[PDB]
Amino acid sequence: ALGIKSCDFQAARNNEEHHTKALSSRRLFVRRGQPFTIILYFRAPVRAFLPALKKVALTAQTGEQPSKINRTQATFPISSLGDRKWWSAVVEERDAQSWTISVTTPADAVIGHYSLLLQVSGRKQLLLGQFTLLFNPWNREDAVFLKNEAQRMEYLLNQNGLIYLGTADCIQAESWDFGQFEGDVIDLSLRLLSKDKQVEKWSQPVHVARVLGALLHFLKEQRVLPTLLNKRRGSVPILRQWLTGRGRPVYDGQAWVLAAVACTVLRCLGIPARVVTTFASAQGTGGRLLIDEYYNEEGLQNGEGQRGRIWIFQTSTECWMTRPALPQGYDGWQILHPSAGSCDLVPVRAVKEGTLGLTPAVSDLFAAINASCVVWKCCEDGTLELTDSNTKYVGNNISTKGVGSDRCEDITQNYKYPEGSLQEKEVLERVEKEKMERESPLYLLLKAPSSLPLRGDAQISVTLVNHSEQEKAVQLAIGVQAVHYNGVLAAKLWRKKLHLTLSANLEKIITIGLFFSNFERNPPENTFLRLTAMATHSESNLSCFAQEDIAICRPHLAIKMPEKAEQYQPLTASVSLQNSLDAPMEDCVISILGRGLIHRERSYRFRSVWPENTMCAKFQFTPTHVGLQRLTVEVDCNMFQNLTNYKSVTVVAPELSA
């Protein structure tokens, strides 16, 4: 008399309550430690409620070999006496033909695909349905608990992120579609996690993050090809291609996408995450705090590069969680650090305080933002002379997306003390001590702009100061080379050789025009300009050296759109682009996209734009999803490709009427 007709999991309402509505309105996605409501329907009216309640139990199971000892199987009754901090179920409302049941799960539940079964006493099991269980940053007792609602929305719910590329002095924000709530991303993430056979550990955010970081780094190494090829559409297509091998591969010039991809996967599983960009990052030193750079007498570099190089920038995934297995006080932001393999989670604080030994990867991360650069001059004779070089600072302008805005947040102070400060002094001395125990007349100043306009012009200055009593015959070599984001030399562009005489104790300023038209060849796309100056005097055996990184600045893509918009109404956005280049823009394509605004994307062809002329193209579209949406516009032409910009708009529901 207790037969079951159907069970409604109320996916829409529960997903709204559990902040998973972006995933689906049909499949039940719930976050652990928080109750969700189901409705059990009976084939016939239920006469006696209490005996029927005594007759029914529920079973949750996850995995292929569920068991209690693995905590992948929980059997619990349906009663008001159930442990609400554990698996439990209680009837809240009851009609003669149905029970509204509130089901809780423990705050440390194993995440993944779960089956819910109902056992009537002296009867065979009945599958009620399936649900997916995720980490819960909204629950105080969860290891991934986030204090702030704004932080939860930014680091877990926002699918429209910003990845900061460029150079420390010229930071370019690229709109990125994390897409963590795309339909198949959760399934892909859980299938990837299934490669780890320690399912009982899946209740631990630290273990899940470590496993997924290692697996994603392995996939990146296997799938990213050696060098449009640079046209990106967010994390989700990359994840699909990496896991299936189908789709457009990513090439090494954009290997930094790994940090974004990880951020997607974590975010889909309920682990708050953010992508952090570190500019001038000393990669490949193996904990050593010295970087050797080698230049020839023209101020240029001959080889592709050393193993230890100062990358123009490096992306990293930070994830939020407690660290129960570490000494107290390391809860909060953790850095995922793969090692060519296995991945380590490093509390950001440990990097700041130089706590080398807390985790294996602390030393490498600390060296990445604390190493010192030594410059060597390579002589044609073969002599490898030491050089008096300008200080090349590492770990600059550590940047991430700000909370509740499209603004850039600098978080450098979380990773490092101010240069020259007492605290930095103490940390550096302690680290130097640990490593030790375990194991001129001319002054040159280089002034350059932070950016060089595409096919444009710039001015650079070299101040040479002679401290000798004798006037000096100086040879000044100036070199402009192309370098990839990861510090790999790309192309020698320009070289200049001045022969100057400096009067004793007299400063002298040489102004030099840095013009694209003088380059021996166009810089490869996504490269930066390494500018070098090398002054050598007579036979002193020592040469002054200065270097700078310059970003290439492309024409600004202005987007003009209303700040607010009404759902289900037309909305116009005008895109303007001024051709500041020296040649016409041909093969002109403009693509528009954005989640909740445009289904997939739309590409249009606009007319060729002569130099000093302006494109002004208007697009009309109807937003259909309420909320803070983003329009992304991408321009391609024969002069430049993948020139992206974005603009946010708040779509409001229609005014209530009859």
Side-chain angles (χ1 to χ4, degrees), residues 280-301 303 305-338 340-485:
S281 183
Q283 294 291 312
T285 64
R288 187 169 136 231
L289 298 174
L290 292 168
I291 287 282
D292 303 312
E293 291 184 2
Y294 297 84
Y295 298 81
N296 58 26
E297 258 142 8
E298 313 194 293
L300 298 166
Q301 302 182 78
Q306 311 302 291
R307 180 174 312 65
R309 306 187 307 277
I310 293 158
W311 295 23
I312 278 67
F313 72 80
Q314 171 64 304
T315 59
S316 65
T317 315
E318 269 189 14
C319 53
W320 183 268
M321 69 199 66
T322 61
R323 300 301 304 271
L326 295 190
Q328 187 274 316
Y330 288 109
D331 296 0
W333 285 116
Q334 324 293 323
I335 306 143
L336 263 178
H337 188 251
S342 209
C343 193
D344 186 35
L345 263 198
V346 184
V348 167
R349 178 142 88 81
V351 176
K352 198 188 163 148
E353 292 166 3
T355 314
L356 279 66
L358 190 77
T359 83
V362 165
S363 160
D364 271 22
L365 290 168
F366 183 88
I369 60 174
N370 289 283
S372 70
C373 184
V374 174
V375 180
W376 298 91
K377 176 172 63 169
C378 311
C379 299
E380 278 98 68
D381 200 302
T383 338
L384 212 66
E385 307 272 20
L386 176 60
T387 273
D388 185 306
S389 66
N390 86 290
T391 303
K392 176 145 158 200
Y393 295 107
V394 292
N396 294 293
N397 301 101
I398 303 184
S399 296
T400 200
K401 183 170 173 300
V403 170
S405 73
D406 302 316
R407 308 178 60 87
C408 184
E409 200 70 62
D410 199 292
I411 66 168
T412 319
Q413 69 180 120
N414 309 162
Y415 282 79
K416 318 153 51 56
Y417 290 103
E419 268 84 80
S421 57
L422 248 59
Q423 297 99 272
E424 187 218 7
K425 212 273 212 157
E426 176 275 324
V427 174
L428 264 296
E429 298 185 314
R430 179 164 32 68
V431 172
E432 290 330 276
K433 191 186 72 240
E434 204 283 316
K435 267 125 157 53
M436 225 71 213
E437 289 201 295
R438 205 225 70 257
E439 191 202 56
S440 200
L442 196 43
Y443 169 65
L444 185 149
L445 168 58
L446 184 64
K447 173 236 76 168
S450 66
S451 88
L452 175 67
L454 177 58
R455 305 273 344 141
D457 281 324
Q459 291 285 303
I460 57 133
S461 170
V462 176
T463 300
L464 304 183
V465 166
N466 175 4
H467 294 88
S468 146
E469 286 311 273
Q470 311 132 88
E471 69 168 15
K472 214 120 315 316
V474 56
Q475 201 225 351
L476 180 70
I478 303 163
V480 179
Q481 192 161 353
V483 312
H484 296 288
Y485 91 97

Side-chain angles (χ1 to χ4, degrees), residues 24 65 80 82 100 125 137 183 188 231-232 235 255 291 322 325 370 401 436 451 515 532 558 576 579 594 601 616:
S24 168
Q65 285 333 285
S80 324
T100 301
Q125 257 190 328
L188 288 169
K231 191 181 295 304
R232 295 270 67 79
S235 300
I291 287 282
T322 61
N370 289 283
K401 183 170 173 300
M436 225 71 213
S451 88
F515 316 144
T532 55
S576 295
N579 180 7
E601 70 187 73
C616 216

Side-chain angles (χ1 to χ4, degrees), residues 405-600:
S405 73
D406 302 316
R407 308 178 60 87
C408 184
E409 200 70 62
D410 199 292
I411 66 168
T412 319
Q413 69 180 120
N414 309 162
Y415 282 79
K416 318 153 51 56
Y417 290 103
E419 268 84 80
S421 57
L422 248 59
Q423 297 99 272
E424 187 218 7
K425 212 273 212 157
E426 176 275 324
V427 174
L428 264 296
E429 298 185 314
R430 179 164 32 68
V431 172
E432 290 330 276
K433 191 186 72 240
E434 204 283 316
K435 267 125 157 53
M436 225 71 213
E437 289 201 295
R438 205 225 70 257
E439 191 202 56
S440 200
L442 196 43
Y443 169 65
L444 185 149
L445 168 58
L446 184 64
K447 173 236 76 168
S450 66
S451 88
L452 175 67
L454 177 58
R455 305 273 344 141
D457 281 324
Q459 291 285 303
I460 57 133
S461 170
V462 176
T463 300
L464 304 183
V465 166
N466 175 4
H467 294 88
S468 146
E469 286 311 273
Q470 311 132 88
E471 69 168 15
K472 214 120 315 316
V474 56
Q475 201 225 351
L476 180 70
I478 303 163
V480 179
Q481 192 161 353
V483 312
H484 296 288
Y485 91 97
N486 68 346
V488 172
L489 278 312
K492 285 173 209 63
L493 307 183
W494 192 55
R495 67 199 69 201
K496 175 130 192 162
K497 212 141 268 288
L498 285 321
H499 299 79
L500 307 119
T501 36
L502 317 103
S503 318
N505 293 276
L506 169 56
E507 181 170 89
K508 175 143 134 80
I509 315 187
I510 297 70
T511 301
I512 293 133
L514 182 35
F515 316 144
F516 257 77
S517 56
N518 282 322
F519 291 179
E520 302 147 11
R521 66 204 81 263
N522 243 356
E525 60 71 58
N526 299 345
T527 61
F528 307 85
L529 301 193
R530 173 66 54 70
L531 173 77
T532 55
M534 176 157 288
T536 282
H537 51 297
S538 59
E539 212 280 273
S540 198
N541 219 55
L542 186 51
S543 299
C544 294
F545 179 81
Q547 65 173 294
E548 288 299 334
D549 305 301
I550 311 181
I552 295 150
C553 187
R554 311 193 282 180
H556 177 250
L557 186 58
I559 296 146
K560 170 175 313 330
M561 196 163 51
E563 197 80 31
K564 294 240 181 302
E566 166 163 5
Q567 186 193 20
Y568 303 142
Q569 297 295 333
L571 172 83
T572 292
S574 46
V575 182
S576 295
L577 189 56
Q578 219 267 303
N579 180 7
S580 40
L581 312 173
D582 52 24
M585 281 171 54
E586 311 255 321
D587 325 309
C588 274
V589 181
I590 180 161
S591 313
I592 58 170
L593 59 86
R595 175 183 313 276
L597 299 176
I598 301 162
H599 170 72
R600 309 191 162 187

Side-chain angles (χ1 to χ4, degrees), residues 37-46 48-226 228-290:
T37 306
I38 63 171
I39 310 181
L40 198 59
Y41 292 94
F42 304 93
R43 312 217 194 74
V46 198
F49 175 62
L50 299 163
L53 213 67
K54 267 142 163 143
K55 274 214 234 283
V56 296
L58 291 175
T59 288
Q61 329 190 283
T62 187
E64 46 293 355
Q65 285 333 285
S67 64
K68 308 208 157 261
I69 77 90
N70 267 5
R71 288 146 64 253
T72 50
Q73 173 164 295
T75 300
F76 45 105
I78 311 180
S79 65
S80 324
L81 296 171
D83 186 4
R84 291 313 263 171
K85 303 340 295 150
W86 195 65
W87 296 94
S88 78
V90 63
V91 169
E92 309 289 56
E93 291 310 82
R94 44 207 198 74
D95 195 320
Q97 296 264 27
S98 64
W99 296 352
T100 301
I101 295 145
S102 180
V103 179
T104 58
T105 72
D108 68 328
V110 168
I111 59 142
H113 301 299
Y114 275 81
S115 239
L116 189 57
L117 310 135
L118 171 88
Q119 288 108 279
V120 188
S121 60
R123 224 186 52 87
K124 204 214 109 193
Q125 257 190 328
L126 164 75
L127 167 64
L128 294 178
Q130 321 278 344
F131 68 94
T132 301
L133 197 53
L134 308 168
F135 295 109
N136 199 340
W138 285 264
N139 187 46
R140 219 176 40 172
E141 301 101 314
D142 199 320
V144 297
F145 177 59
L146 260 176
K147 269 204 303 311
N148 250 317
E149 185 62 47
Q151 282 178 49
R152 286 186 296 254
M153 293 172 336
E154 176 50 38
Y155 302 131
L156 206 83
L157 296 182
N158 197 1
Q159 299 181 92
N160 291 335
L162 299 164
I163 311 309
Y164 292 95
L165 318 173
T167 54
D169 295 337
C170 193
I171 303 178
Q172 291 111 258
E174 178 53 35
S175 56
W176 190 266
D177 176 24
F178 282 121
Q180 65 263 30
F181 302 133
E182 184 53 38
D184 58 329
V185 168
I186 182 57
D187 294 321
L188 288 169
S189 302
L190 284 177
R191 214 161 325 111
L192 189 57
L193 178 60
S194 92
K195 253 62 91 193
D196 163 72
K197 267 63 192 128
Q198 315 188 87
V199 293
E200 68 284 346
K201 307 234 174 106
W202 292 10
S203 61
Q204 302 169 37
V206 171
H207 178 82
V208 171
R210 277 214 281 252
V211 156
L212 291 179
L215 287 163
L216 285 174
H217 183 85
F218 177 85
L219 288 170
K220 185 227 62 157
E221 295 292 358
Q222 268 33 78
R223 299 277 204 207
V224 171
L225 304 180
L228 292 138
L229 294 214
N230 287 287
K231 191 181 295 304
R232 295 270 67 79
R233 293 290 186 265
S235 300
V236 170
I238 300 170
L239 182 69
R240 289 173 180 151
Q241 198 273 331
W242 285 2
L243 291 170
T244 80
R246 292 189 320 272
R248 299 193 298 117
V250 175
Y251 292 82
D252 49 15
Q254 294 178 311
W256 48 263
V257 300
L258 174 58
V261 169
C263 178
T264 286
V265 165
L266 300 175
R267 278 197 193 182
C268 95
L269 294 174
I271 297 173
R274 60 190 190 169
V275 176
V276 170
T277 296
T278 300
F279 298 94
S281 183
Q283 294 291 312
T285 64
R288 187 169 136 231
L289 298 174
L290 292 168

